A paper describes a structure:
Multifunctional autoprocessing repeats-in-toxin ([name]) toxins, secreted by multiple Gram-negative bacteria, are primary virulence factors that promote initial colonization, dissemination, and lethality in a wide range of hosts, including humans. By doing this, the clinical strain [name] MO6-24/O generates a [name] toxin (MARTXVv) containing four effectors, which are arranged in the following order: domain of unknown function in the first position (DUF1), the Rho inactivation domain ([name]), the α/β hydrolase domain (ABH), and a Makes caterpillars floppy-like effector (MCF) with a cysteine protease domain (CPD). Previously, we reported that DUF1 and [name] within MARTXVv are not uncoupled by activated CPD in host cells; rather, they are discharged as a duet (it is assumed that the DUF1-[name] effector module acts as a functional unit). The data show that DUF1 acts as a [name]-dependent transforming [name] domain ([name]) that disrupts NAD+ homeostasis by hijacking calmodulin.
Consistent with the pull-down results, isothermal titration calorimetry (ITC) analysis revealed that the effector duet binds much more strongly to [name]+-free CaM (dissociation constant (KD) = 80 nM) than to [name]+-bound CaM (CaM/[name]+, KD = 1.93 μM), with a 1:1 binding stoichiometry. The structures of both complexes are identical (RMSD of 1.323 Å). Taken together, these data demonstrate that DUF1 is transformed into a NAD(P)+-hydrolyzing enzyme by [name]-dependent CaM-binding.
Numbering used by the authors:
A (entry chain A): 1968 to 2371
B (entry chain B): 5 to 148
Write the structure that this text describes.
């Protein structure tokens, strides 16, 4: 099974992000950002939802077996309300066995894309006839398996909503628990879709990243891991309006999350900032609970931290090199530095931070990529050398750069 | 602007230097500024290309350069920017955030990081061994 493969990939990642916590076990794996809320249920009531579900399944125009309907709904409902990992996968495995493909249609000629905004279709169109390579962008909507899972999930959500009383709020806690559980579903399945991304990936998020949305919480992690495996290249973020990306080549469409300028937004969740903003904005109109509030925080500042904390982290970001300390001397590969070719840099003082910054700046000035670099580089005695067949002293330092 | 401050900027500007004369190519000014510890935006960089006027060949001399660093250095305050960026994941009033909260944040916002690089830093910050982190403390330890 191909989704059991992906599922297994996803279960690791969730367990890797849970290592400090260690709240994950067998069967229960926590979806990042999807708090598990389980409260007491009357047992038979499950059957009410079970048989509703089952009915719904086969009295709907879906590619499911006739009598299989009871089976499916039983599996699904247990799987959701119990936060059982094996059942969640089994449900997914089962669906895959009814000709529900959990994979993008243009298997290799598809650009797996992410939309977590408003008007994906508009963006998608510009993005589609921009590729000069016959490449067509694909959303999670396009995956028949995904969509059908979301449909059934939607139905159980709706059951809770319109069969229950908020008035009696011990009933509300049962509603909040069912809402919480169905939320982790959509969350898990977005990590399934996201582990299938290859090459350059497109992300639609107008007005910057939205902290605590699906992209941030489940998609971006799965995409990060894929990069460190070398399977994904640039994650391109379209946080500006569609016009700004109009009549631009596919390479040049979008930037990175970590670049300066990209904004962050929340749903106006804080105890007293709602009120601060409330009397400072019940002035004109107001704010709905889901209104997105533009924060003034810089994700770039966290990237900046790394550049001044980890050695040669800027060659990584700006030149896609991976300088690691080796047996003696730094060894350099193209990032993520699992691929063959290896070059070397020797410093005359490998721990001095002034020294690392110098050879760092030097490399950014002389080489645009890894393949342009000589096989050996030396920062010695205020001179920089290189050996590539014959030794040359490319620059000397007497308060400046005396190239030659 | 300290005299010390100009010494490093003179040194940084020696390299990147095309014609080896004192001209720095426009596009690379962006790169050089990013190395010297200031991150100007896509638009803000265009300000320095216009605010210091540009009319084609060269014109980005060393004197123009340390003018912007001055300008840019004024309106941006890096240590509070990093503190601000770690408090959004505060959510609890208290200075600490969960080590799992941190790991999640460091993975997303560390683009050319590796799993083991992220593992190592979550251990280093988790002095207490309980699975909580002083976000300031953690900054403090990566400023050394």
């Amino acid at each position: 099974s191909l989704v059991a493969a992906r599922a297994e990939k996803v279960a690791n990642l969730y367990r890797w992000l849970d290592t400090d916590n260690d709240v994950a076990t067998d069967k229960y794996v926590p979806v990042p950002g999807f708090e598990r809320v389980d409260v007491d249920v009357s047992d038979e009531v499950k059957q009410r939802m079970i048989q509703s579900m089952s009915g719904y399944i086969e009295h709907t125009d879906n590619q499911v077996p006739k009598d299989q309907a009871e089976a499916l709904a039983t599996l699904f409902v247990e799987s959701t309300l119990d936060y059982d990992w094996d059942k969640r996968v089994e449900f997914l495995t089962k669906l895959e066995s009814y000709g529900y493909s959990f994979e993008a249609p243009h298997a290799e000629k598809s650009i797996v894309s992410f939309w977590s905004g408003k008007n994906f279709k508009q963006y998608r169109d510009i993005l589609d006839n921009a590729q000069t390579d016959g490449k067509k962008v694909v959303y999670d909507i396009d995956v028949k398996g995904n969509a059908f899972a979301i449909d059934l999930n939607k139905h159980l959500m709706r059951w809770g909503g319109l069969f229950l009383d908020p008035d009696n709020a011990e009933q509300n806690q049962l509603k909040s628990s069912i809402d919480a559980a169905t939320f982790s579903n959509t969350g898990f399945w977005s990590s399934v879709y996201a582990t299938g991304a290859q090459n350059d990936v497109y992300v639609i998020a107008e007005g910057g990243v939205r902290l605590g949305n699906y992209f941030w919480n489940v998609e971006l992690p799965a995409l990060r891991q894929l990069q460190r495996e070398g399977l994904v290249g640039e994650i391109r973020l379209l946080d500006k309006p569609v016009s700004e990306y109009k009549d631009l080549p596919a390479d040049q469409i979008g930037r990175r999350l970590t670049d300066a300028g990209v904004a962050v937004k929340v749903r106006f969740d804080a105890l007293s900032h709602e009120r601060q903003a409330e009397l400072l904005a019940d002035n004109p109109d107001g704010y709905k609970a889901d209104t997105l509030v533009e924060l003034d925080v810089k994700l770039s500042a966290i990237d900046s931290m790394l550049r001044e904390s980890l050695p040669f982290y800027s060659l990584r970001t700006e030149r896609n090199l991976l300088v690691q300390e080796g047996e003696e001397g730094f060894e350099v590969r193209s990032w993520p530095g699992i691929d063959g070719k290896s070059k070397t840099i020797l410093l005359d003082n490998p721990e001095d931070a002034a020294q690392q910054k110098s050879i760092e700046r030097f490399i950014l000035a002389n080489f645009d990529n890894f393949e342009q670099m000589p096989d050996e580089l030396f920062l010695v005695d205020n001179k920089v050398l290189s050996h590539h067949d014959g030794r040359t002293r490319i620059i000397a330092q007497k308060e400046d750069g005396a190239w030659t | 602007l300290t005299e010390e401050q100009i010494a490093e900027f003179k040194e940084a500007f020696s390299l990147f230097d095309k014609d080896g004369d004192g001209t720095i190519t426009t596009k690379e000014l962006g790169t050089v500024m990013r190395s010297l510890g200031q991150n100007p935006t896509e638009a803000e960089l265009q300000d320095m290309i216009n605010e210091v006027d540009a009319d084609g060949n060269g014109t980005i001399d060393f004197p123009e350069f340390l003018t912007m660093m001055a300008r840019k250095m004024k309106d941006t305050d890096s240590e509070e920017e990093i503190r601000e960026a770690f408090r959004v994941f505060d959510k609890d009033g208290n200075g600490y955030i969960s080590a799992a909260e941190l790991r999640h944040v460091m993975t997303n916002l560390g683009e050319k990081l590796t799993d083991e690089e992220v593992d190592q830093m979550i251990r280093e910050a988790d002095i207490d061994g309980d699975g909580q982190v002083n976000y300031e403390e953690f900054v403090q330890m990566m400023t050394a």
